[PDB]
mmCIF file of C-alpha atoms and ligand atoms in Angstrom:
data_model
loop_
_atom_site.group_PDB
_atom_site.id
_atom_site.type_symbol
_atom_site.label_atom_id
_atom_site.label_comp_id
_atom_site.label_asym_id
_atom_site.label_seq_id
_atom_site.Cartn_x
_atom_site.Cartn_y
_atom_site.Cartn_z
ATOM 1 C CA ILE A 1 32.460 -18.305 33.604
ATOM 2 C CA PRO A 2 35.746 -16.394 33.810
ATOM 3 C CA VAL A 3 38.600 -18.158 31.954
ATOM 4 C CA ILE A 4 42.289 -17.589 32.581
ATOM 5 C CA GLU A 5 45.070 -18.528 30.167
ATOM 6 C CA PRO A 6 48.296 -19.092 32.010
ATOM 7 C CA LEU A 7 51.519 -19.902 30.222
ATOM 8 C CA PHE A 8 52.078 -23.647 29.903
ATOM 9 C CA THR A 9 55.711 -24.762 29.787
ATOM 10 C CA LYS A 10 56.589 -28.161 28.337
ATOM 11 C CA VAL A 11 58.012 -30.647 30.839
ATOM 12 C CA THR A 12 58.401 -33.920 28.926
ATOM 13 C CA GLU A 13 57.130 -35.703 25.801
ATOM 14 C CA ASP A 14 56.116 -39.036 24.231
ATOM 15 C CA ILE A 15 54.427 -40.711 27.180
ATOM 16 C CA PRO A 16 51.524 -42.903 25.911
ATOM 17 C CA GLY A 17 48.385 -42.057 27.834
ATOM 18 C CA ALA A 18 50.395 -39.771 30.183
ATOM 19 C CA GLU A 19 48.670 -39.893 33.592
ATOM 20 C CA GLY A 20 49.191 -40.022 37.367
ATOM 21 C CA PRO A 21 51.635 -37.159 37.949
ATOM 22 C CA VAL A 22 53.013 -37.281 41.472
ATOM 23 C CA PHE A 23 55.896 -35.971 43.604
ATOM 24 C CA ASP A 24 57.660 -38.202 46.111
ATOM 25 C CA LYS A 25 59.100 -37.228 49.476
ATOM 26 C CA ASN A 26 62.418 -36.239 47.941
ATOM 27 C CA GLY A 27 60.690 -34.007 45.446
ATOM 28 C CA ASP A 28 61.291 -36.403 42.559
ATOM 29 C CA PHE A 29 58.603 -36.387 39.866
ATOM 30 C CA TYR A 30 56.852 -39.392 38.360
ATOM 31 C CA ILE A 31 54.227 -40.073 35.743
ATOM 32 C CA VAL A 32 52.631 -43.245 34.417
ATOM 33 C CA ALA A 33 52.299 -44.326 30.805
ATOM 34 C CA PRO A 34 49.302 -46.657 31.000
ATOM 35 C CA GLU A 35 49.003 -47.088 27.203
ATOM 36 C CA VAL A 36 52.388 -48.580 26.391
ATOM 37 C CA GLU A 37 51.816 -51.949 24.745
ATOM 38 C CA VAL A 38 54.000 -54.759 23.534
ATOM 39 C CA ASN A 39 52.501 -56.919 20.773
ATOM 40 C CA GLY A 40 49.118 -55.351 21.464
ATOM 41 C CA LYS A 41 49.130 -56.423 25.128
ATOM 42 C CA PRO A 42 49.394 -54.068 28.074
ATOM 43 C CA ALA A 43 52.928 -53.143 29.130
ATOM 44 C CA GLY A 44 52.289 -49.909 30.975
ATOM 45 C CA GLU A 45 55.094 -48.055 32.691
ATOM 46 C CA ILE A 46 55.894 -45.896 35.671
ATOM 47 C CA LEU A 47 58.492 -43.271 34.913
ATOM 48 C CA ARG A 48 60.659 -40.843 36.782
ATOM 49 C CA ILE A 49 61.177 -37.495 35.004
ATOM 50 C CA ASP A 50 64.274 -35.395 35.557
ATOM 51 C CA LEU A 51 62.758 -31.908 35.799
ATOM 52 C CA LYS A 52 65.926 -30.249 34.588
ATOM 53 C CA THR A 53 66.269 -32.088 31.278
ATOM 54 C CA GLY A 54 62.868 -33.586 30.655
ATOM 55 C CA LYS A 55 64.598 -36.946 30.323
ATOM 56 C CA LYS A 56 62.592 -40.005 31.216
ATOM 57 C CA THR A 57 63.529 -43.203 33.048
ATOM 58 C CA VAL A 58 61.230 -46.165 33.306
ATOM 59 C CA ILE A 59 61.513 -47.438 36.860
ATOM 60 C CA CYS A 60 58.788 -50.049 36.747
ATOM 61 C CA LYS A 61 56.962 -51.940 34.027
ATOM 62 C CA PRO A 62 54.613 -53.972 36.259
ATOM 63 C CA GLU A 63 53.407 -57.446 35.274
ATOM 64 C CA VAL A 64 51.894 -60.176 37.407
ATOM 65 C CA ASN A 65 52.153 -63.712 36.080
ATOM 66 C CA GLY A 66 52.760 -62.423 32.568
ATOM 67 C CA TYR A 67 49.852 -59.938 32.658
ATOM 68 C CA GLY A 68 51.163 -56.454 32.122
ATOM 69 C CA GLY A 69 49.697 -53.481 33.918
ATOM 70 C CA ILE A 70 47.884 -50.338 32.856
ATOM 71 C CA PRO A 71 49.113 -48.063 35.692
ATOM 72 C CA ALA A 72 46.937 -45.014 35.688
ATOM 73 C CA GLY A 73 47.138 -42.953 38.856
ATOM 74 C CA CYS A 74 49.381 -42.388 41.821
ATOM 75 C CA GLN A 75 49.723 -41.097 45.355
ATOM 76 C CA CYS A 76 52.884 -40.974 47.449
ATOM 77 C CA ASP A 77 52.858 -42.593 50.919
ATOM 78 C CA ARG A 78 53.865 -40.592 54.007
ATOM 79 C CA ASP A 79 55.660 -43.001 56.334
ATOM 80 C CA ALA A 80 57.776 -44.534 53.570
ATOM 81 C CA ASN A 81 58.869 -43.057 50.253
ATOM 82 C CA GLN A 82 56.851 -45.409 48.049
ATOM 83 C CA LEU A 83 54.105 -44.872 45.475
ATOM 84 C CA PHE A 84 50.630 -46.334 45.573
ATOM 85 C CA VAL A 85 49.561 -46.827 41.998
ATOM 86 C CA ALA A 86 46.058 -47.511 40.699
ATOM 87 C CA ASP A 87 46.357 -49.934 37.760
ATOM 88 C CA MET A 88 43.551 -50.793 35.391
ATOM 89 C CA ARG A 89 44.645 -54.410 35.060
ATOM 90 C CA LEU A 90 46.426 -55.081 38.342
ATOM 91 C CA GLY A 91 44.367 -53.220 40.905
ATOM 92 C CA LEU A 92 46.464 -51.388 43.500
ATOM 93 C CA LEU A 93 50.259 -51.612 43.459
ATOM 94 C CA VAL A 94 52.872 -50.326 45.855
ATOM 95 C CA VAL A 95 56.030 -49.335 43.945
ATOM 96 C CA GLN A 96 59.423 -48.513 45.430
ATOM 97 C CA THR A 97 61.830 -45.952 44.001
ATOM 98 C CA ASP A 98 64.082 -48.818 43.025
ATOM 99 C CA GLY A 99 61.384 -50.078 40.656
ATOM 100 C CA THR A 100 60.309 -53.166 42.603
ATOM 101 C CA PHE A 101 56.627 -53.453 43.310
ATOM 102 C CA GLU A 102 53.973 -55.555 44.993
ATOM 103 C CA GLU A 103 50.364 -56.181 44.087
ATOM 104 C CA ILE A 104 48.119 -55.389 47.059
ATOM 105 C CA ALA A 105 44.870 -57.221 46.380
ATOM 106 C CA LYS A 106 43.451 -59.952 44.253
ATOM 107 C CA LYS A 107 40.208 -59.842 46.244
ATOM 108 C CA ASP A 108 38.476 -57.320 48.496
ATOM 109 C CA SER A 109 37.449 -57.550 52.157
ATOM 110 C CA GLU A 110 34.358 -59.480 51.250
ATOM 111 C CA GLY A 111 36.243 -61.991 49.115
ATOM 112 C CA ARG A 112 35.017 -60.463 45.828
ATOM 113 C CA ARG A 113 37.565 -60.321 43.008
ATOM 114 C CA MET A 114 39.288 -56.969 42.913
ATOM 115 C CA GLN A 115 38.526 -54.524 40.094
ATOM 116 C CA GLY A 116 41.065 -52.583 38.051
ATOM 117 C CA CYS A 117 41.673 -49.088 39.445
ATOM 118 C CA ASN A 118 42.229 -45.679 37.912
ATOM 119 C CA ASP A 119 43.074 -42.996 40.489
ATOM 120 C CA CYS A 120 43.448 -42.680 44.244
ATOM 121 C CA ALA A 121 43.673 -40.145 47.010
ATOM 122 C CA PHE A 122 45.102 -40.476 50.493
ATOM 123 C CA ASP A 123 43.280 -38.705 53.291
ATOM 124 C CA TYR A 124 45.240 -37.310 56.225
ATOM 125 C CA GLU A 125 44.361 -40.350 58.326
ATOM 126 C CA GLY A 126 46.330 -42.446 55.825
ATOM 127 C CA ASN A 127 43.346 -44.174 54.263
ATOM 128 C CA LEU A 128 43.447 -44.495 50.496
ATOM 129 C CA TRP A 129 40.280 -43.854 48.485
ATOM 130 C CA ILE A 130 40.389 -45.430 45.014
ATOM 131 C CA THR A 131 38.264 -45.423 41.879
ATOM 132 C CA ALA A 132 37.820 -48.659 39.999
ATOM 133 C CA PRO A 133 36.213 -48.166 36.582
ATOM 134 C CA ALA A 134 37.598 -51.421 35.151
ATOM 135 C CA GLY A 135 36.139 -54.862 35.726
ATOM 136 C CA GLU A 136 37.967 -57.691 37.433
ATOM 137 C CA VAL A 137 41.762 -57.583 37.582
ATOM 138 C CA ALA A 138 43.980 -59.878 35.473
ATOM 139 C CA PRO A 139 43.792 -62.682 34.592
ATOM 140 C CA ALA A 140 40.143 -61.796 33.966
ATOM 141 C CA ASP A 141 39.478 -60.441 30.491
ATOM 142 C CA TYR A 142 39.760 -56.617 30.573
ATOM 143 C CA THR A 143 36.527 -54.624 30.676
ATOM 144 C CA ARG A 144 35.635 -51.061 31.570
ATOM 145 C CA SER A 145 32.489 -49.295 32.774
ATOM 146 C CA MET A 146 32.185 -46.691 30.062
ATOM 147 C CA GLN A 147 28.863 -48.091 28.807
ATOM 148 C CA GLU A 148 27.576 -50.058 31.793
ATOM 149 C CA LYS A 149 27.498 -49.101 35.448
ATOM 150 C CA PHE A 150 29.880 -51.512 37.122
ATOM 151 C CA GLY A 151 32.598 -49.126 38.296
ATOM 152 C CA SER A 152 33.331 -49.233 42.018
ATOM 153 C CA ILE A 153 34.966 -47.185 44.791
ATOM 154 C CA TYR A 154 37.295 -48.691 47.419
ATOM 155 C CA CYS A 155 38.947 -47.558 50.609
ATOM 156 C CA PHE A 156 42.234 -49.308 51.373
ATOM 157 C CA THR A 157 42.652 -48.688 55.078
ATOM 158 C CA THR A 158 45.510 -48.266 57.511
ATOM 159 C CA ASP A 159 44.745 -51.716 58.927
ATOM 160 C CA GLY A 160 45.168 -53.172 55.432
ATOM 161 C CA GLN A 161 41.610 -53.900 54.390
ATOM 162 C CA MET A 162 40.503 -53.327 50.829
ATOM 163 C CA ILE A 163 36.919 -52.312 51.358
ATOM 164 C CA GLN A 164 34.492 -51.785 48.570
ATOM 165 C CA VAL A 165 32.546 -48.645 49.582
ATOM 166 C CA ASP A 166 30.323 -48.022 46.577
ATOM 167 C CA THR A 167 29.368 -49.508 43.243
ATOM 168 C CA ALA A 168 27.459 -48.934 40.018
ATOM 169 C CA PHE A 169 29.299 -45.956 38.596
ATOM 170 C CA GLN A 170 29.763 -45.354 34.882
ATOM 171 C CA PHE A 171 33.537 -44.906 34.848
ATOM 172 C CA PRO A 172 34.589 -43.393 38.188
ATOM 173 C CA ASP A 173 37.904 -41.671 37.528
ATOM 174 C CA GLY A 174 39.385 -38.758 39.507
ATOM 175 C CA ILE A 175 38.979 -38.665 43.241
ATOM 176 C CA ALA A 176 39.897 -36.253 46.020
ATOM 177 C CA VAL A 177 39.453 -35.779 49.741
ATOM 178 C CA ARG A 178 38.488 -32.531 51.418
ATOM 179 C CA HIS A 179 39.616 -31.957 54.976
ATOM 180 C CA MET A 180 38.573 -29.676 57.798
ATOM 181 C CA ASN A 181 41.106 -27.038 58.759
ATOM 182 C CA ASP A 182 41.989 -29.264 61.749
ATOM 183 C CA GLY A 183 42.888 -32.079 59.353
ATOM 184 C CA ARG A 184 39.826 -34.291 59.764
ATOM 185 C CA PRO A 185 38.726 -35.840 56.458
ATOM 186 C CA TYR A 186 35.125 -35.038 55.749
ATOM 187 C CA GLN A 187 34.161 -35.114 52.097
ATOM 188 C CA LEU A 188 35.078 -37.430 49.222
ATOM 189 C CA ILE A 189 34.667 -36.177 45.658
ATOM 190 C CA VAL A 190 34.506 -38.686 42.794
ATOM 191 C CA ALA A 191 34.431 -37.910 39.052
ATOM 192 C CA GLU A 192 32.071 -40.006 36.899
ATOM 193 C CA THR A 193 33.547 -39.263 33.503
ATOM 194 C CA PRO A 194 30.931 -39.687 30.762
ATOM 195 C CA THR A 195 28.012 -38.451 32.829
ATOM 196 C CA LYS A 196 29.706 -35.044 33.339
ATOM 197 C CA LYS A 197 29.178 -35.193 37.079
ATOM 198 C CA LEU A 198 31.264 -34.978 40.224
ATOM 199 C CA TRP A 199 29.764 -36.905 43.128
ATOM 200 C CA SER A 200 30.322 -36.149 46.821
ATOM 201 C CA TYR A 201 29.990 -38.160 50.008
ATOM 202 C CA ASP A 202 30.351 -37.330 53.679
ATOM 203 C CA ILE A 203 33.303 -39.177 55.136
ATOM 204 C CA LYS A 204 32.149 -40.408 58.529
ATOM 205 C CA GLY A 205 35.278 -42.436 59.277
ATOM 206 C CA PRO A 206 37.769 -44.796 57.694
ATOM 207 C CA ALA A 207 35.988 -46.595 54.833
ATOM 208 C CA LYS A 208 32.692 -45.037 55.924
ATOM 209 C CA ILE A 209 30.938 -42.786 53.446
ATOM 210 C CA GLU A 210 27.298 -41.645 53.376
ATOM 211 C CA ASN A 211 25.082 -39.089 51.726
ATOM 212 C CA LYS A 212 25.963 -39.585 48.068
ATOM 213 C CA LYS A 213 25.133 -36.435 46.133
ATOM 214 C CA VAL A 214 25.611 -34.921 42.707
ATOM 215 C CA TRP A 215 28.048 -32.220 43.800
ATOM 216 C CA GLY A 216 29.356 -30.679 40.650
ATOM 217 C CA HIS A 217 28.540 -30.316 36.976
ATOM 218 C CA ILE A 218 31.250 -30.599 34.310
ATOM 219 C CA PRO A 219 30.776 -28.326 31.267
ATOM 220 C CA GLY A 220 30.368 -29.566 27.747
ATOM 221 C CA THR A 221 28.925 -32.344 25.499
ATOM 222 C CA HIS A 222 32.247 -33.466 24.111
ATOM 223 C CA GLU A 223 33.294 -37.067 24.464
ATOM 224 C CA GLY A 224 35.196 -37.157 27.763
ATOM 225 C CA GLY A 225 34.541 -35.333 31.041
ATOM 226 C CA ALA A 226 36.230 -35.102 34.449
ATOM 227 C CA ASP A 227 39.424 -37.093 34.673
ATOM 228 C CA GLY A 228 41.978 -36.188 37.424
ATOM 229 C CA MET A 229 41.524 -33.620 40.202
ATOM 230 C CA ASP A 230 43.186 -32.012 43.198
ATOM 231 C CA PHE A 231 42.508 -29.325 45.720
ATOM 232 C CA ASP A 232 44.356 -26.060 46.092
ATOM 233 C CA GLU A 233 45.136 -24.691 49.550
ATOM 234 C CA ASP A 234 41.836 -22.834 49.769
ATOM 235 C CA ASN A 235 39.922 -26.008 48.913
ATOM 236 C CA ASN A 236 39.037 -25.014 45.395
ATOM 237 C CA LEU A 237 38.936 -28.236 43.343
ATOM 238 C CA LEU A 238 40.724 -28.234 40.039
ATOM 239 C CA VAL A 239 39.557 -30.841 37.605
ATOM 240 C CA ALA A 240 40.939 -31.901 34.244
ATOM 241 C CA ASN A 241 38.001 -31.960 31.801
ATOM 242 C CA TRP A 242 39.283 -34.297 29.134
ATOM 243 C CA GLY A 243 38.130 -33.296 25.667
ATOM 244 C CA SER A 244 37.147 -29.756 26.654
ATOM 245 C CA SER A 245 40.559 -28.036 26.480
ATOM 246 C CA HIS A 246 40.076 -26.771 30.056
ATOM 247 C CA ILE A 247 40.726 -27.544 33.710
ATOM 248 C CA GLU A 248 37.637 -26.542 35.644
ATOM 249 C CA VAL A 249 37.913 -24.797 39.002
ATOM 250 C CA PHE A 250 35.148 -25.451 41.551
ATOM 251 C CA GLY A 251 34.768 -23.508 44.755
ATOM 252 C CA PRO A 252 34.267 -25.322 48.043
ATOM 253 C CA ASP A 253 30.507 -25.564 47.592
ATOM 254 C CA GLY A 254 30.598 -27.208 44.161
ATOM 255 C CA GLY A 255 27.848 -26.714 41.570
ATOM 256 C CA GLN A 256 29.155 -25.088 38.420
ATOM 257 C CA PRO A 257 32.833 -24.185 38.019
ATOM 258 C CA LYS A 258 33.723 -20.681 39.232
ATOM 259 C CA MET A 259 36.614 -20.351 36.771
ATOM 260 C CA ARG A 260 38.096 -22.303 33.882
ATOM 261 C CA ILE A 261 41.734 -22.621 32.880
ATOM 262 C CA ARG A 262 42.339 -22.865 29.150
ATOM 263 C CA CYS A 263 44.987 -25.425 28.133
ATOM 264 C CA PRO A 264 46.766 -25.387 24.771
ATOM 265 C CA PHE A 265 45.483 -28.941 24.114
ATOM 266 C CA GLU A 266 42.097 -30.617 24.157
ATOM 267 C CA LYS A 267 42.698 -33.497 26.515
ATOM 268 C CA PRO A 268 44.140 -32.668 29.931
ATOM 269 C CA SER A 269 44.062 -35.981 31.807
ATOM 270 C CA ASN A 270 45.449 -35.295 35.257
ATOM 271 C CA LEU A 271 47.352 -32.810 37.374
ATOM 272 C CA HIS A 272 49.490 -32.403 40.513
ATOM 273 C CA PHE A 273 50.934 -29.451 42.419
ATOM 274 C CA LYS A 274 54.639 -29.398 43.184
ATOM 275 C CA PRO A 275 54.957 -29.125 46.993
ATOM 276 C CA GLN A 276 55.553 -25.642 48.406
ATOM 277 C CA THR A 277 54.736 -23.984 45.028
ATOM 278 C CA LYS A 278 51.859 -22.788 42.892
ATOM 279 C CA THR A 279 53.088 -24.951 40.003
ATOM 280 C CA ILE A 280 50.646 -27.488 38.565
ATOM 281 C CA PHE A 281 52.010 -30.255 36.355
ATOM 282 C CA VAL A 282 49.486 -31.477 33.846
ATOM 283 C CA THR A 283 49.424 -34.655 31.775
ATOM 284 C CA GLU A 284 47.544 -34.647 28.490
ATOM 285 C CA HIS A 285 46.600 -36.991 25.672
ATOM 286 C CA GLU A 286 46.464 -34.777 22.633
ATOM 287 C CA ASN A 287 50.299 -34.823 22.555
ATOM 288 C CA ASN A 288 50.932 -37.510 25.197
ATOM 289 C CA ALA A 289 53.022 -35.033 27.125
ATOM 290 C CA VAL A 290 53.437 -33.233 30.415
ATOM 291 C CA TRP A 291 53.347 -29.476 30.986
ATOM 292 C CA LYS A 292 53.309 -27.104 33.937
ATOM 293 C CA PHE A 293 51.702 -23.797 34.733
ATOM 294 C CA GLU A 294 51.373 -21.394 37.621
ATOM 295 C CA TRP A 295 48.084 -21.385 39.558
ATOM 296 C CA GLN A 296 46.900 -18.568 41.848
ATOM 297 C CA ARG A 297 48.096 -20.220 45.041
ATOM 298 C CA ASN A 298 49.761 -23.331 46.499
ATOM 299 C CA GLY A 299 48.231 -26.825 46.381
ATOM 300 C CA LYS A 300 46.506 -28.374 49.350
ATOM 301 C CA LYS A 301 49.188 -30.487 50.985
ATOM 302 C CA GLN A 302 49.077 -34.138 50.035
ATOM 303 C CA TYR A 303 49.273 -36.824 52.714
ATOM 304 C CA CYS A 304 52.986 -37.336 51.921
ATOM 305 C CA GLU A 305 53.681 -33.724 52.868
ATOM 306 C CA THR A 306 52.236 -34.104 56.355
ATOM 307 C CA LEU A 307 54.047 -35.349 59.431
ATOM 308 C CA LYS A 308 53.325 -38.379 61.488
ATOM 309 C CA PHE A 309 55.182 -36.817 64.405
ATOM 310 C CA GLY A 310 54.178 -33.175 64.141
ATOM 311 C CA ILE A 311 53.321 -31.299 67.331
ATOM 312 C CA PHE A 312 51.074 -28.825 65.523
HETATM 313 CA CA1 CA B 1 42.335 -40.878 35.405
HETATM 314 CA CA1 CA B 2 47.120 -35.247 41.362
#
């Protein structure tokens, strides 16, 4: 498989478990530090990074009834400048730029206790697809589906339902939505980390997925596997392969990667394009740091970059 070796430029440092890179509607850049702990208990953080200086500001250190969060992944909303954050202890949070936040769900649409979440992806219809590799949210004792298949997938819909849409994954992690050129969502891709697979479904409608399939194969026998992912503007899927020192690039039909991108570190965890550029910001756990590099083309627009009131 062809491998390219772009120049990685350091962005910021010392972010425990650096994850969830995201740009808001003002172009501000955020990351989460899920692994910050106080007295051995979770005290994860959501940070804003000043791209000019690399200086970090913690805007939110979420805790619910004394249970601190493990915020792990993010998406920016479209209609309001607020971040939806998947948290391994707290489930799904909505966080404002002022640092205030709310916890969205203690239970799902069927009254089942909510599971801790890892990453999420808005489709263009505004529905939010979320991976949930942890067990029940706080105050339940923390567990994760790395050994046993209890990880779930949710769709948090525009009408505010938190719908469990699949179950029994061994650590579902990255997630992405592919759209038709006319903007209709039609495929969901979900990383199952340790099994070295990417799974696909057909999106039939809000919270409606069918035709589960093993869509892609992640290279390697290292400990780790697919972590975060995102599409570029031609619908190639770029996937951080934690432990492999590469980001894998899959073409629109999946299968094996068509190209790999060598990183100067073994553990890329997640990535995000900066809007209107070819720049991909990458979080990684070898150094607990953030970097950026130039890809071959622009990212596929995120939901936050689209317009509610477009004409075209
Ligand atoms: Ca992740
Ligand atoms: Ca991303």
